[PDB]
Structures are given as structure tokens and as C-alpha cells.
Amino acid sequence: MKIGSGEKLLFIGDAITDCGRARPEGEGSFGALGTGYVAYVVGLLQAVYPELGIRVVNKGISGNTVRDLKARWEEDVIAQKPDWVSIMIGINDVWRQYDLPFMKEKHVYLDEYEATLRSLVLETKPLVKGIILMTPFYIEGNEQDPMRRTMDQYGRVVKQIAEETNSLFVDTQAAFNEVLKTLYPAALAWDRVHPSVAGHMILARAFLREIGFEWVRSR
Amino acid sequence: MKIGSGEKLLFIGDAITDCGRARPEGEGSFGALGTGYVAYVVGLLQAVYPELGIRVVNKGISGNTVRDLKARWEEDVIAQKPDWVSIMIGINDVWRQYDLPFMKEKHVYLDEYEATLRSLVLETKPLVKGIILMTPFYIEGNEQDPMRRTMDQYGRVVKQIAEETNSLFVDTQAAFNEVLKTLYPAALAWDRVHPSVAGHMILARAFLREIGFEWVRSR
Amino acid sequence: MKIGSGEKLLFIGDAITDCGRARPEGEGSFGALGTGYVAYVVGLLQAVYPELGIRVVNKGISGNTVRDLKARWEEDVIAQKPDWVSIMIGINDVWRQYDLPFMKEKHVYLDEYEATLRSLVLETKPLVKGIILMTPFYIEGNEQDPMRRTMDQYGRVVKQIAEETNSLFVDTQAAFNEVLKTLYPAALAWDRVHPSVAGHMILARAFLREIGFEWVRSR
Amino acid sequence: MKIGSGEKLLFIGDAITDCGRARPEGEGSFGALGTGYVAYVVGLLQAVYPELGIRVVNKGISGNTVRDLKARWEEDVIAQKPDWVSIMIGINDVWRQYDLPFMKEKHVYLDEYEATLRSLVLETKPLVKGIILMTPFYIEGNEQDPMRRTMDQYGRVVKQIAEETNSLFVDTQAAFNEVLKTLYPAALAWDRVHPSVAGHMILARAFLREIGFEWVRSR
Amino acid sequence: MKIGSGEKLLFIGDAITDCGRARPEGEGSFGALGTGYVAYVVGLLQAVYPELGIRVVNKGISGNTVRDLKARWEEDVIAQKPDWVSIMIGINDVWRQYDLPFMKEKHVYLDEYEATLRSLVLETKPLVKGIILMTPFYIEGNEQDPMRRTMDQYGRVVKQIAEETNSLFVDTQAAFNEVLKTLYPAALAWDRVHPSVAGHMILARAFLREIGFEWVRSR
Amino acid sequence: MKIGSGEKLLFIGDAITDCGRARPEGEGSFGALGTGYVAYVVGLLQAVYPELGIRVVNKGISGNTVRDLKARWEEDVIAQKPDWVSIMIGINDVWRQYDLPFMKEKHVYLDEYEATLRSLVLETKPLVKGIILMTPFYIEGNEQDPMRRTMDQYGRVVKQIAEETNSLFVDTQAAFNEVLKTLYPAALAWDRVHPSVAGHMILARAFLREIGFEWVRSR
Amino acid sequence: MKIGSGEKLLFIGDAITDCGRARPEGEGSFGALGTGYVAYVVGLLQAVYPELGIRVVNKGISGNTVRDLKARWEEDVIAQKPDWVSIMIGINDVWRQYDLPFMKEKHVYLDEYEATLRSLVLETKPLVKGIILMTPFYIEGNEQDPMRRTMDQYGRVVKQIAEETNSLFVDTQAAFNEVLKTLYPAALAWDRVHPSVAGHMILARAFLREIGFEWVRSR
Amino acid sequence: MKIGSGEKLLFIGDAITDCGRARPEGEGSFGALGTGYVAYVVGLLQAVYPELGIRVVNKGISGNTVRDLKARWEEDVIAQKPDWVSIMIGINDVWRQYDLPFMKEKHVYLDEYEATLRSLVLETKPLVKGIILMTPFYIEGNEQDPMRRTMDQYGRVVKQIAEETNSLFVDTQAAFNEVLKTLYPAALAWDRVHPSVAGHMILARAFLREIGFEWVRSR
């Protein structure tokens, strides 16, 4: 398991990460982590590795783009002195291009996205033990749907940043795509973004698998 | 203007027609019509044809399939003694097939849909001046998206029923398709079903055009 | 159509413009525009000219007079860098004279009204592409009702300001007067000011007509 | 003071009488009388005639026409065994004709109104010490405003019924008319019906004057 | 009538004056005056002297003693530039001595009361047209009840201040005492302080009588 | 300790006994007993006699007179099969006479009170181990205050009934009288009826003393 | 995977199973399953076996003992025609004995518990494909804590019933015991019963393991 | 009785002391003291020693540790100029070690606890008349439960501080332990910390006994 005892794991992102977490602190065992994948990861780690003694902080904020992450990075990431930082950002960067196509200042285009995410990862890498970069996703099985096509591009940028910088990488899109071989998007998320428990389990499992979680530990 | 002075026009359907209308009666100038296309239709008819004294009733109920309309048809339609009945149904009949693909009792397949809608029209036709059949719609430009493809099947049946019964006919899908040459669905409805004011306006306008509304009357 | 692609159209006024819009921003497609004529205009433009790509901002504030407009003009109009500004102000300027006749400091009399509205239009004209001046209105068909008589005077001032300055002009009063040939005021607005959907449609149509909107575009 | 010691005085009418009174019973010192003219009458009678021990019941119900009063008359009036009954009805009977001019089943025209009110008086007269008939009113100074003109028609019938049946009589319209020589209606009621404290005071005072209240007793 | 046209009458006091008035402004015809004697006075003046054109402001604050009045006097009285100031203070000054007998810093004893009320009246007298001093009261008919005995003492101080300074004077206690010849306190106020509508009418009438109000104006 | 192990002790009365208890059942450790003297009694019995396993039920209902207790006696008392019944009633029977002196149907005069309370005791006596009769009370030190004077009349009857029936007896008025040598009523209850925690403690203690509670047991 | 395609899996129990599920039906993807282990099970089954089309129903009801399950068994279980039934009951049967040790009618002792649970299994066995019996649990590591000791007694009976009836079997207490080697109970449940997300995950995982879930399928 | 007339007694602590007290002041007879042991102490003192005239202030704050006490000590204790200070702190200092074992900065370990509590007592002792030190507690009868074992250690430190400094001392733990010979913890507190009325009575009695309260004063 990549995460070790006594370490502090900090998740950051948009609504998908927030899921109603306690503001500002985002920390503790009885609801402060919100009700989605971040809480499920913490739950599963505690259920299967109770002894690892990890602290987990949820700094997700509904509505955020990577520009919003940059503006709060000092106080919400650096100042928390985490050991591990998990980032999942891009959904809003992209979605605003499609749901508010004429409010361009709300858009974070690929240049701004790459440059900003790159800069946050580079600044954070030497200060922590590790970084996990999760791709954004869109719950949509047609690669040529325009927003899915853009989201896949943004995930390609996350993947190069995680390779230019050496971070762990979780392709959340590939995790949905597998389920989408069976289910129409609406079965998981009417709006193709905010999913049911099942979607948050897909995310939580995609994360855990990347960090070497075992469902039943061997022995 | 197909609708004559003093006549009663009754809308029925699902949430798109409902839009928070007052239950049970669904009738009045100050909010009982709900906040969507029905209200818009009435508003425009009053703004442009105030002298017509048209009474409008909204019997939409969110969640309904055509099976649900049949169950309340005597009480909600027949007993109201309308002069004109406008039906818009099918969205849920189809949506359940894709969001709850394993709760089949929620689904109304196209055979049942068609016979049931025909039964509503055939019962009602001799009691009214006219019937307006509005197709269901899905705000999705790709004809091959599985739910759009199914929706079009149901809209084709509506069109056939209208032709066969000599009802008026509004192709709501065609109205959306035009706008979807420019806008990505999310700019109109995150969930591809429940739309912005703009979407309700697309509907209202499509209805008004079919009943011979003039934006600036020659009369 | 007077408004062109990529332009930003900013509406300002009192409750009739506000209609519950989102504060402070007043901008976006899913409710931030409020529930009255401003949202209806945006809806109709999107339904019939989806490609025009216009941004619309609602800066209406319930209770305002033109004195209140002046106090927030810098931040709420100039600083938004709009291309088009639509103003509809005067109802409260006048109504306070009649509903609180002894609280004179609440009144904005014709001198203050002309001088202030004039100054806002003159300052704004060189900074934008265009200005739309809408008259205030009172839903009352008797010209000699004292408040209607005063409101018509205030509309005459708006009309000269729009001619001294060259702005588009919408006579909202004349739009109501036509409907009031049929309907008693209470059918549209118990209080002769805050109307039903139908009244907001009268306003929205009066606006659209002035800016050259076509219900069905020719071709 | 027409009302004698130990007697029960029952008010009935629409919202003007109701004013949020406690349902069903409408009786008590600490709020059950509602917050308008009925409460004011009781307050003044207690402040100036505390020894009279007058019991007061408020059976107003907002929305009612005289057709609605007849429907509840046995239960709300007759069964209460009052000594004095005060009726104020007609505002809605008339208002619906102007705000919902095409929902005719809401309207009570003057013929029906008159016979129905006569029926209430004639049934009740032999069971009580007295009846007070208060005219309806419309807070509007122009006699030729269509709704004021209709209202006056109904008030004239009330006055005739009072004369014919030997009931006491309060002309509420005449009380407002006096004040309307100074105030524009809006200063008393935006909607010309539901008034400020001042309007409720105009009513209370008009009632009290008719039952022989003295502001400073010679007794 | 002591109050004249165009004058501004400002009431100040504790809960008995506040009665839920709008904060901070305390001014206007549709609820800002609260629901007790101050609103009733304004209502009766408007009903019987609509032409006097008086402005009325309610600056009452629940919980206040005269020490609290002094701390806000500049902003809430002087800065409002009233023509007439009505003060009714003392209830809490006294009640705290009895309901929280051991929290002495909450008490305003007779020395502090006389000195402070005196100083406010002396400072205000040359800046306004007139001052009305209303005694505090306790709804309790036994002169030897300790709190009633203290309250009567505090009223004696108000009466000398109104004579040392020449102000109008309203003995609210004597107005209650008359009613208390018939009614037990609980019929007017369970807690002997916060009364029913009837109590607020006793107060409103005691005020009006002092300022020369006529119920029916002669002529 | 008169109450034995495993026994059921049932309290009945008005609001003083009720204090927000859970309806209908009024039984449990975590809030169903309400927040006054009953809860305090149970708390102390558990703190000092935990081994007794006493079940306590609270059947107080705010507003009740002894006429109301008789109406629910079979269901609320007899059917519960208690071992001990504690009654406290009379406050309202008397209070209505003074706060609603002209709604006589709310009043229970002393003759009716006495016979009705005797009937409750006489029916219940053979079914239980014991009965505790608590006097009503009025927090008012002057014996000649009309309501205190009446209350004492009713308490004297309670005491006589207890003597005659061999019931236990708690003089709540005597307990208050002692405290009222120091405190003015308002320091315990603004309304002279519903008291602070201290007043509920005065009651609880008076009850406990009568059933032989020891604050520090010799056992 | 013991559960087959198209099958219906029904959970029953107390609050641990309930977790705010939708009443009465307890069925759907978007919240009706509640927010605990049942929801987690469904989420994981959908994330990993989306093609199975398993229908899940949640019939938990907070507060229930096995006596309560028997009372609703025909309606909540039998009439639902499930393929698999999972039962988790006993926590309350035991807890009442310790939190309300003197309200015995709340307690279900082990003899009654065992026969009643056997009756549920024996009735249901011939109607379903399978039964899963989950033990009750108490989050408390000391086997000699009186409530843990009782709980283990009931879990031993569950295990015996499962053996005897050939049901599947989940020892929830053993799953907690493992985690309790590291965590003090409070880190999972202040009250030792209702757990954090982590505790619900411990349960979900224990259930999934017993039905042959694979975290990463070889299929 | 150790507390004397006219003295101010200030209680400080965590939720057990707070119990919903009014913030910031925490002072007065009608609810500001919260609903637990502090209010019960004040009630019993008033019931049995009404003449002592003591003022009581509740400065408890839910969640506090002794580190939190130190941070607010100046404003909430010293600045209130109390005569007597009662402290009960330690529950959270300890509980966080067990319920959030990995959030170490939330823990107040024995060194910090002793040093801080010591310093607050030493600084406060010369400024007041007396100090009461109450041990923290855990409602758990097994001395070897790890949290109970730690809590007893923290109580030993309180006891030495009260002996190093000469303060009164209340062993709240010993008071619970006596009841816990009969009752399982859950009968008093599901979570072993926040108890029922009975638990607050155990605390209130343990306090009162230490300050020499007599249930029935001799004489």
C-alpha cells in the first residue's frame, strides 16, 4: 500500500470530491469527509487497514476549476502540510464551456488548465511524500460526444503532467467506461457528472486500486 | 388562432407540463399553472389575445407515463369538459428504461404506449373541439444516443396517431434539434430532460405556432 | 436584430427587472436572471436566435428609484463593461409619492428624476454600443388616475432623454394600455405594478419588438 | 351602546373580517380574533366598557363570497347562538368579476347576491337581538372606476336590505371616501382591498359609531 | 390637536413601544410601526385626521431601560430630527429589580432613572417642538404590591420631570387602574406588563387624549 | 421511600405536570417525561435509588382542568394500571375565572371541582397502592390577591380530600409561600404560574419529601 | 457471486439496515436504500457487476426487535417475493435490556428471540433461493462487558440457526472484533451501535465476502 | 454552606457544563443557564436557600479541552470577577485520544493537562474567594476500559491540583461509579459521556454535597 502509517492524505477537487464535507476543516471520522468517494476510501482503509493510522482531509469545493484551486492552494494544501495530495479537477473547467458557452471568463481552456495544474503539481511535489493525480471524467460512453471528447483531452494532460512529474495516476474515465459498456449514463448520473453511490464506489475503487489497496490482505 | 373565445384548453403530461402547478385544480392567472411552458403559453395568449377569454387548466403530474395518464383520464380530463386537450407524454415511459433498466414495471414499451395513447385520443376526440399531440423529446443531438433513438421511435408514433386521428401535432424534438445545432444539451438541460426558461420557451413557441398564434396580429 | 453576436446585454431597474435574480452577479442560464421579463427575453432570444451567443446580466434591485441606480451605477453597470444597457426605472420614484405621501425624502420628483436619468444615460452612452430606455408604467387604464397621470409624465421624460441622447425607446405604458382596453387592472396586477406572467410577457414582447426580434425569422 | 352586558357578538365576512383569526372557533382575548378591525373593536370595547363582558367571535374566512357564507351559515352563525351578528360581504363577489373575468363560477352577480344576503338576514333576524350590515368597500375614489362602480351597486343593496329588515347599517365605502379626499388608495391598500392598520381603524371606528360607542363615556 | 401638519412624531421606549417594529428605521405605513399602541395611534390619526400629514417613527427596543435609551439617544432620537418625541420608559428599570433581584447591574435605580431621564429631556427640549412623557406602568391593581409601588414611584419622577421641563404627560398607570377596577390583571396581561390588543388600546387612547385627539371632530 | 421496587408511578395534571412530555405514552429515560418537576423527580429517584426500578409515566396535558382529567381518566390513568397516582390540578380551573372571566364554560367552580376530584380519587383508590394529591398553587404572596385567594380555597379542598381518602398530600402553595418571603413572584414566574427550573425544583422537592425520599440514604 | 442475474435481494433489520431508507418501498438507485451498508453493497455490486441487474430492497426499520420483524414479515418480506433475504436483528432485542432495564416489554430474551428468528427463516426458506443471516453486533472489545456478552449469546444462536437451516451466515461481531484490536469503540461508534462510514463499510464488506463478491473479478 | 450571600459563582467546562447555555453571557434565571447540572444546582439553591442571593454564570462550551479554557480564561473567567469558580474539564482532553486517535493535535495529553489546569488554578486562586475542581468522568464501570482508566488518571491530577492549591474537590467519577453498581452505562448515557436528567442530577448532587448544601436545613 503506497500510503503508510501516520501519514496525512489530503484530497482536493470540485463537488465530486467535496460531497458536503465540513468547511473549512474537512477533517474527521463522523461526517466531515462528505458523503462520496473520499469518505468511502477512508472507510475502506479503516475497515481493512485500521492500524495504518492515516489522517484524511477533504478540501473539495463544489464549483471549482483549477483556477480556483490555484487561488486557495496555499491555505488549503501547502499550509495543511500533507504527506499525500490527491487532485481531481477538470470537470468544471470543461463543463462551463458547454453549459455556459457564452460566459467565456468562466471557461478554463486547455492552455490555462495544463499550465496551472502543472504549476501546482511542481510546486507541491518537493513538499510532500507523494501526489495522486486523478483525471476528470464525464459519464458518457460516446467518445465523440463533444464534452466527453474534451474531457478525454483534459485527462491526457493530467496523464502527461503525472508522467512529466512522476505522480500516481488514476484514470477515472477508464473506470466509468467499463461500466458504461452495460449501463446508460442516466443509470449512474442524470447529468453525466454527479453520480449515485455506485459512481462514487467506481471512483473510490479506482483510487484504492492505484494505491495498492487489497480487499483481503495476504497473508 | 385555432382556439376560440370562451373555450377551455387543458394541458396534460409529466413534469415538463406540471412545473409545480397547483394541485388538484391547476387553474388561475397568479401561479396555479406552474412556471414552464404552459404558463408561458397562457401569458402570451393573454398578452396578444386578451379578448379571447380562454380558460386554461394544467393537469401535468411529474413522473407520469402514459399508463399513469390513462389511470387518471376520466377524472383529470373527461370530467373537466375541455374544448381542447394538449397531451405531452412519453419522456418517462422511455427514461425509466435507461435510468432504472432493471425496474421493468416502471417502463412502458412502445407497443403498450401506442395503444394506450390511441385509447386516450379515441375516447376524447368525440367530446372536444380538438386535440393537440405534442411529441416527447430528449435534448440530445446524436440520433444514435440510445435514449434519443428510443425517444424518436415514440415521437414517430405520436405523429402517426395525430395523422390518423386528425389531431393537431407539435414535434418538440424537431424544435430542439434546431437549437441543438448550436447549443450542447447541457446549455439547455443538464439532465437532457428538464430545461431552462429557454427550453420552456422553445416548447411554448412550438405549441403556439401549431395553434396559429401570431406574434403581431394582422387583426 | 439590434443586438449582435457575442454582445453583453445588461438590464437594470427595480423589482420589475429584478424578479428574484441572483445577487450580486445576476448572470447565467439556470435561474440567476429571475423569473420575469428579463428571463423571458433571454429565453426567447435563445429559442429563436441560439447562435447569437449573447450574454445577459440582470442588475435589477427591488425598491430602487433612479437615485438608487446612480449610487450603484459604477459597480453594477460601468464595471460590467456591457455592450448594451437596458434601463427601466421610475415606478418607485413615482409610487412613493402616492403610497408614502408624507415621507418626502423617499420621493424622487421630476426634477431629480430627469436630471439623474439624463446624467446616467449621458455618462453611459459613449462607453457602450447601445442603450435601451424603457418607460416606467402603471397598470391602470384611466389617464386621469393621479398616479397613472404622473407615471405618464415620467415616461415623457424618458422619451425625451432617449431622443436628446439617441437611445432605443420602449413605451411599456402603451403596451399595457392596449391590453387594458380589455382587462381590468386586477386581472394583470392586484397592485397595478407587479404583474402576472402575462404582464411580464407584455414587457418582454415590448422589448423584443423594439430590438427587431422576429418570432419566425425570414427566410 | 347597543350591545348589552353578557351578550355575544359574532362577526362574519371575508379576509377583511378574518385577518388570520383562529380556526374554527375564532374566540378569545390573546390573538384568536385576528389582527384587524374585529380585534380593534374588541380592544376598544374592553378599554372603554370593560364591565360589559361582551363575548366576541370572529367567523371571517378569507376568499368568501356571500354564496360561501350561506354554505356555512347554520354551523358558523346559527349554531353559535349569537345575540348580534355583523356581516361584511361582497368584496370578493365583485372582485372576481374583475381579476378572473373568465372564471364565472367565482362571480356572484348582484341579483343572486341580494337574494342570498336577504336570506341570511331573514333567517337570522328572529334568532338574535340585532344585525349589523356592513357594506363591502373598494378603496378607490373614482366612482366610475369599473370595480368601484360595481361595488357601490352592491353597497346600495346592503343599505336597502338594512332599511327593509330594520338592521343596523355601516357604510364602509362612505368612511373610506372621506379619507380618499386626502389619500391616494395606495397609501391605504396597494391592492385597493386589504388595508393598513389605518384602514382597519377606519372600519372599526365606523362599526363602533353605528353601535353607539362613546370614546369618553358620559356614564 | 397638539401635533400639526407635516410634523414628525418619534416614539421611543422598550418592548411596549417596539412591538416588533422594523429595525433600524422604524418608519412607514405597512408594518414597520409594530403591532401595538404606536401603530394604533398612527392608525387612528390617519383615520380621523388624514390631512394632517404626520410622519411617525418607532424607535422602541425590547429590553431597554433608560440607560439603554441614553446610549442610543444621539443616533435614534437627535439624528432623526423629530418634531415631537414621545418617551415611555421605566418598566424594565423597575422589573429587573424584581425578576433578577441579584443581578444588580441590570437594575436602574431611582437615582439613575431620574438623573438620566431628566438629562435626555433637557437635552432634547430645545431641539424639538414638543416632548410627550408617558409613565411606565404595571398591570396590577394593588398599590402595595411591591413592584406596582415602585412603578408608581418611577411615574412620580416622570411627572416631576414633565413639570420641571414643561412636557406633555400621560399617566398610563391611571388608565390601567380604571380598567383594573373591573378586570383582574391576567385578563389583560398574564405577566402584568405585555398586554393584549385591549391594553394597547388603553395606551393608545391615553396618548391620544393627551394630545387633544377627537374621536369625532367638531364641527 | 413509600414507592416500592418495580412499581409504576403515574403523574397527571396540567402544563406544570406536562412540560412538553411525549404524547401519548409519556414514558422513558431520555426526554419523554418533559423538562419539569416530573423529570426532576425521576432523575433524583434514579440518582439516589437506582435499584428501585420505578417506572414513571407522565400524563400531564397543558390547559387541563379537573373536568378534562375526568374525561380522559379511564384511558390515561385506569388503563395504565399504575401503583401510585399523583394528581396536580386546579390551576386552570381557577385561572380561567380570572383571565377569561366572561367565557364561563372554561371555568370549573369549586363545588364541581371538589366533587369531580373526589370522584377521581374514589374510583382510583381501590386499584392502586397509593395516591398523592398535590395542591394547585399560585406564585403570589398576597393572600388577598383575588386569584391567590381562590387558589387557596381549592387547595384547602384538596387537603380535605386527601385527609378523607387517606391519600398522601403535598401542599405546593405552602412550599412556594416560604420562598415568596424572599423572592417577588416574577423572579420565579412572570405569569405567576409557569416557573423557572427553581420553581420546578420547589415542586419536585415537595413531592419527594412527601414520599419519604432521603437526599443521603441511611440505607 | 451467489446472487444471480435479475434476482431480487431484500434486506431487513433495524436502524443499521434502515439508515434513512425510503418508506415504504425502500427501492431505487438515487437514495431510497438509505446511506449505510445496504447502499454500499448495492454500490459495489453495481460498480463491479453492473450486468447482473440485481434488484435490491431495503426493509430496515429503526428500533425493531425480532418481534417487530415477525409482525411485518408477510407484508415486508413475503409479499415482496424476493430471491434472497438478508436478516440482521438482535441489537435492540438486547440493547433495551441494558438502556431500559425496567421497561421489560421492550426486551426480547434469547429464548423468544431464537424461536422467533427460526420461525422467520423456516417460513421463508421454501419461498426463496437463499437466506443470509447476519449476526447482531456490539462495538465493544471486552467480551465480559455485560452487553457484549449478551450480544455474543444472540450471535451464537444466529450461527446455529444458519447451520441448521443451511442459510448463508455473516459474523458481524467477528468483523468488528478484528478492527477493535486497533481502535477503541468510540472511534467507530460513540454509542457502540450506530457506526461511522467505516463501520458500515466493515458490514458491507463482511456481507459481500459471504456472497462471493470479488473486488477484481477473474471473469 | 460554603457559598455565601451576594456571591457570584461561575461554572466553566465543556458540553456537560454548557448544556445549551446562552452565549456569551451565560447568566440569568429563565434558561440562560442551560438545561443540565448547572441549572439544577441553581434551582436547588434557590429552592432551599432563596435568601442567599447568589449570582450564577455558566461559561461552559461544548467541545472544549483545558487548552480551550486557557485561550478564553481572561475574558470568560477573570473579567467576570467571580467569587467562586467551578471547573470541570478533561472529558474531551481524553475522549479525542480515543475517538480520533490519529488526529494528535486534538489530544491534550496528561502533561499538557496538568500543566495547563495547574496554571489556571494558580492564577485564579488569589483573585477569588474560592475554587471548586470537579473531576472529569466517564460513565463506564470497568476500571480497565482504556478510556475509563485514562479518565481516572486525569481525575487524579485534578485531585492533586486541588490539594497542591487547596481547592474544593468533587469526584464526579465516584458519584457515577455508585450508580453503575446497578445500572449499565447505556441507561444513563448511550455514549458514556452525555447523560440523561438522572446523570445531571448525580452531578448536581455531587457538587451540592461538596459545598455543604442541606436538602432540609437544620433547624
Side-chain angles (χ1 to χ4, degrees), chain G residues 28-60:
Chain G
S29 293
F30 316 87
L33 291 165
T35 57
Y37 84 88
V38 174
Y40 299 170
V41 166
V42 182
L44 281 160
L45 288 174
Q46 258 197 77
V48 185
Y49 301 79
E51 76 292 359
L52 261 36
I54 296 159
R55 287 180 74 144
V56 186
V57 188
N58 185 344
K59 292 292 192 180

Side-chain angles (χ1 to χ4, degrees), chain C residues 72-125:
Chain C
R72 66 196 179 86
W73 200 255
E74 244 310 301
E75 180 45 37
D76 287 359
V77 182
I78 304 310
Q80 299 309 295
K81 298 201 178 306
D83 298 299
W84 290 82
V85 177
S86 170
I87 301 165
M88 183 158 54
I89 201 74
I91 284 169
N92 296 315
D93 306 58
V94 169
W95 204 358
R96 301 295 80 75
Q97 303 180 40
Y98 292 98
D99 77 346
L100 293 169
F102 308 122
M103 297 182 63
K104 296 183 195 329
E105 79 288 348
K106 295 200 126 145
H107 305 182
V108 178
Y109 292 115
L110 193 71
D111 60 333
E112 178 171 5
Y113 180 79
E114 187 274 354
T116 306
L117 181 55
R118 177 167 175 280
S119 165
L120 298 177
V121 174
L122 294 179
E123 171 194 351
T124 307
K125 184 211 206 333

